[PDB]
Amino acid sequence: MLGMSYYNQKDYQTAAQTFITYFNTYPRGTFTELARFHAGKSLFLDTPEPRLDQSSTYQAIQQLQMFMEYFPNSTKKQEAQDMIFALQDKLVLKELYSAKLYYNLGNYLGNNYESCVITAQNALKDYPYTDYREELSILILRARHEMAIYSVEDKKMDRYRETIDEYYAFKNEFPESKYLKEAEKIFNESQKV
């Protein structure tokens, strides 16, 4: 048995590989849920900053999901539950930065504001229950109005009504929110047309 020594020295790679290789070669090795869950947190703790490669975070998600079904009896099911939530929020934060980048560049070469709305909508659909739903929704609303401004004169009223639909959808989703003031100026500009 070695993994816990590597875990105490914060060498997460060796701790992780000495734990997992032992409970892969025999379903519990001889340390059972302790090795599994130490390996799960060790794999979690190497997590990069939210805009690097993310390779270990998908692996962490699937490893914790498969832990929940190898040992559903464990009290560490909760400790994996909130961990997979934290990982999901980081994965969503990456996509949120992507959508923010497309809003920042804007109507530069290409379009980039239609890209912003579809990127953040993909975020909303791929991870339904994240914290960042408010930020993603307001980013949709801002990008909708931004597209409505610069569109060709034959195709502006439809973008305006899409913007007002997003306004009422944001109110339906969040009857109160800290971002309502800018939303309401967007509404007051678009409801005229």
Partner: protein, 520 residues
Amino acid sequence: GQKYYLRNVTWVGNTLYPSEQLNFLLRMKKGDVYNQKLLGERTSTDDDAIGNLYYNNGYLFYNLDPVEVNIVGDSIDLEMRIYEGRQATINKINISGNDRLYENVVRRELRIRPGQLFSKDDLMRSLREIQQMGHFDPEKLQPDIQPDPVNGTVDIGLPLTSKANDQLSLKFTNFSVANLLRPGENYRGILPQGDGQTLTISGQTNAKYYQSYSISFFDPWFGGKRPNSLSVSAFFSVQTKSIKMWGLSLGWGKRLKWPDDYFTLSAELAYQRYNLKDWQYFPVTNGKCNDLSLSLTLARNSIDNPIFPRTGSDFSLSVQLTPPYSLFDGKDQDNMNKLHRWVEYHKWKFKAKTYTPLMDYIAHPKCLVLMTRTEFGLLGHYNKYKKSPFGTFDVGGDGMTGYSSYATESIALRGYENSSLTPYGKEGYAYARLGIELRYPLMLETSTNIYVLGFLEAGNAWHDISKFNPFDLKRSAGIGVRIFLPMIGMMGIDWGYGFDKINGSKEYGGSQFHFILGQE
């Protein structure tokens, strides 16, 4: 057992392109030998084939089938059956392998966008930009295209392979000032990396003949919102009675849209001061001199690989003025340390390179290339007598040797000793350098890159600009090799035989060796 006569050809399913144009692009006619590849290679493999003519235009939801009918006697009648789907819109872009570089840095240089229609030229251009950026390996890049026929969209995976660029001197290539002044969440003992910004420091600490300090910083996306860049630098140096030089500069670059979108304009403003007493290798001997210079440079760059380019070109046209104090703006050894409190000149340059493959390429990508160079320069003067003692050209040899001094511009001319064509009292106010090269690489890899070449140079320089003559040159020839190191720049070996004489003497010609370091 097969037939051998092409009796007719036919098309069905097409709407997007005219049937006669596809007859031409299929390169067939009735009354010709029946084959299979003759059709297939021209319909499913080659870059002008019909299938590629649909695929590259974003119509990826397609299929195709050569139908054979009337299989009688010697003949077959043929009909092209194809499927036209809906033009694919990009749904997602996934990028992986970026160990040490935020996605912010790379997604801003992509030419494709989510929500726009797919096209081959945009994807190829995006890969060219990534290759030229240099933070990833220029080889072993290929996109993982995945379509979805139910929603009719495509998502692109970009697997990338990383390499770190760093070399007394230091070449931090992905160093961030925002991460320096305010760490994100944990600096964790690491340098403040990211954002694609670069920082560089260099200097000599010999101090008994040479001493120097220098620093530079470059931000390719200033403000993080547009492709316009900021560049700043500064320097200082002693050399043994001594000579003192220091200065700084600030510059600003911008991508253009007029001829094409490869052109980049650059503007820069610079300051320098020279400090001397009882010094002797310059015409100036005692005093202090200044210069303010404004530079405009127009450049175009279209190559594929920085380290061993194989297609494209690199053109530059530059002009560098300092205000004309001799005219009414400023109006009024014998008196030469006089009147050069402020120095005056206007320097012009043209510089072009041109890389072609000679054996197809793409296939057997090790390839073989022919290069080509053509550099001209002029250091003009507003007034016949107040010619600048600083900024002159120095030519002959490796070129690197001249960076023991910073008041001149050193130009390599291979096969002629060092600084041979421009000795003391004959400083160069105009020059020309031409020359072919044929190159073959031995190895191209992430860590190290190797290639061998034979050249054919020709160059010259003049002390008097009015005697510029680009058809009277000191010819050369030779062979050489170069090495790129995992944690250092180039090192290479060049041998050359100088053919013509210099100033009536053959002493500097003949066999010569040059030892290149860093980068030309």
